[PDB]
């Protein structure tokens, strides 16, 4: 089963965007479809992402990538997204191909995502696509309030008024960081973790201990916000916040493999 090219779009009237996909088709129509959900400022071409396709492959099933408005190959501007908007575009993606059977797979923001996608599922009645797992890498639910707003200072807060965002150095590029007004805002919008969260399927989340962006600690809370049946959190010592070392995506690779088999 061969990759194929889609666009979606997204939206109506001036909030409008086309989602670029990348689509390989199960073997057989009652398969499941692995769905990547990537992380904030990450393309549909990152490692990990062609590590679940290539997976997908080899077994048969299905596999959809997408990128978000802003970035990689899809329209919209950077400073216009928002957890609302790139949740909407990852539901309009899964709605456009609807597969019978769903396992999300979500790094870091698209963690937080994945479980909001679940809620907006489950709270509808007409409902083709169940989701039947979840594997979740140093996922980032509640970031905005949790993560960023206790470390804002007053530099911080006053970028955002006067300016609409603010910016921070970035470990991994020489382009620094940017965090809109409306990000923060809209992030309280889906908090998830101010309550418990039904998710109806199983959960493995892989999280490092080396991490310096999402402490493991909050993957300690995520679960603590879980059922309390069918939810696995392996902890790698040594693991940092890409996990895409060889031994990381063998580990990532056998979490997927587990919800299919
Ligand atoms: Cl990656």
Redesign the pocket.
Known sequence: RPIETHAITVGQGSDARSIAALVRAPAQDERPTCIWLGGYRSDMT???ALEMDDLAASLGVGAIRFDYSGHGASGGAFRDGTISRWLEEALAVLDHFKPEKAILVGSSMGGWIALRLIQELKARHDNPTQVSGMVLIAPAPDFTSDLIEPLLGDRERAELAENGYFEEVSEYSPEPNIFTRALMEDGRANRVMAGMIDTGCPVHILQGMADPDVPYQHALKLVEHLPADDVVLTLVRDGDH?L?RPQDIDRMRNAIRAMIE
């Open positions: 990152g490692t990990k890409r895409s």
